[PDB]
Design an enzyme around this catalytic site. Structure first.
Site, PDB file in Angstrom:
ATOM      1  N   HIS A  46       0.830  -1.208   0.000  1.00 40.72           N
ATOM      2  CA  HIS A  46       0.000   0.000   0.000  1.00 40.72           C
ATOM      3  C   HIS A  46       0.871   1.267   0.000  1.00 40.72           C
ATOM      4  CE1 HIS A  46      -3.366   2.656   1.764  1.00 40.72           C
ATOM      5  NE2 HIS A  46      -3.910   2.112   0.686  1.00 40.72           N
ATOM      6  N   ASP A  91      -6.625   1.304  -2.210  1.00 43.81           N
ATOM      7  CA  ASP A  91      -7.348   0.980  -0.989  1.00 43.81           C
ATOM      8  C   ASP A  91      -8.115  -0.366  -1.085  1.00 43.81           C
ATOM      9  OD1 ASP A  91      -6.261   3.457  -0.084  1.00 43.81           O
ATOM     10  OD2 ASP A  91      -8.195   4.513  -0.308  1.00 43.81           O
TER      11      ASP A  91
HETATM   12  C1  LIG Z   1      -7.525   4.191   8.857  1.00 45.28           C
HETATM   13  C2  LIG Z   1      -6.565   3.224   8.297  1.00 45.28           C
HETATM   14  C3  LIG Z   1      -5.220   3.417   8.087  1.00 45.28           C
HETATM   15  C4  LIG Z   1      -4.571   2.282   7.526  1.00 45.28           C
HETATM   16  C5  LIG Z   1      -3.158   2.358   7.243  1.00 45.28           C
HETATM   17  C6  LIG Z   1      -2.491   1.805   6.116  1.00 45.28           C
HETATM   18  C7  LIG Z   1      -1.176   2.187   6.300  1.00 45.28           C
HETATM   19  C8  LIG Z   1       0.021   1.982   5.554  1.00 45.28           C
HETATM   20  N1  LIG Z   1      -0.124   1.498   4.270  1.00 45.28           N
HETATM   21  O1  LIG Z   1       1.100   2.234   6.048  1.00 45.28           O
HETATM   22  N2  LIG Z   1      -1.161   2.904   7.463  1.00 45.28           N
HETATM   23  N3  LIG Z   1      -2.351   3.033   8.062  1.00 45.28           N
HETATM   24  C9  LIG Z   1      -5.424   1.217   7.315  1.00 45.28           C
HETATM   25  C10 LIG Z   1      -5.100  -0.098   6.757  1.00 45.28           C
HETATM   26  S1  LIG Z   1      -7.035   1.642   7.792  1.00 45.28           S
END
Ligand SMILES: Cc1cc(-c2cc(C(N)=O)n[nH]2)c(C)s1
Ligand SMILES: [Ca+2]
Length: 122
Positions: A46, A91
């Site tokens: 991601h 996402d």
């Molecule tokens: C609110 C949310 C934040 C994250 C998130 C992804 C990452 C990342 N890709 O580092 N950090 N916070 C979700 C999976 S739900």
């Protein structure tokens, strides 16, 4: 943006988005090292997608986009432009990735000092 990231992850997965806010070496703001497990791999991927989106001229953390949750799965659209479709793909992908994983409590609030300075490639 973050609003849709929260939404998509909770649509597909079984756990609070809070679970991914400081986890492993990659889940949360920034990240470096060897990923500790599958979830940490999802977050490295991601991180890469969002980096790509930024290089394409997008703002992955702020830009709003429409999507639907149908049978605990993400449908992207209607998209007004390319950025909205890239963002929703990023996402959707993390949401699908994390929903297939088991949670390792021991990696929640993992010490950053145990994360190596080098990372795998995107
Ligand atoms: C609110 C949310 C934040 C994250 C998130 C992804 C990452 C990342 N890709 O580092 N950090 N916070 C979700 C999976 S739900
Ligand atoms: Ca990260």
């Amino acid at each position: 943006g973050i609003l849709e990231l929260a939404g998509t992850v909770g649509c597909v997965g079984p756990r609070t988005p809070i679970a991914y806010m400081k986890y492993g070496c990659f889940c949360g703001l920034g990240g470096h090292g060897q990923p500790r497990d599958a979830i940490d791999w999802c977050c490295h991927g991601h991180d890469c997608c969002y980096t790509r989106a930024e290089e394409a001229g997008c703002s992955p953390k702020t830009e709003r986009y429409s999507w639907q949750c149908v049978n605990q799965s993400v449908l992207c659209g209607p998209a007004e432009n390319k950025c909205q479709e890239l963002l929703c793909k990023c996402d959707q992908e993390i949401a699908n990735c994390l929903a297939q994983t088991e949670y390792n409590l021991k990696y929640l609030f993992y010490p950053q000092f145990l994360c190596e300075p080098d990372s795998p490639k995107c």
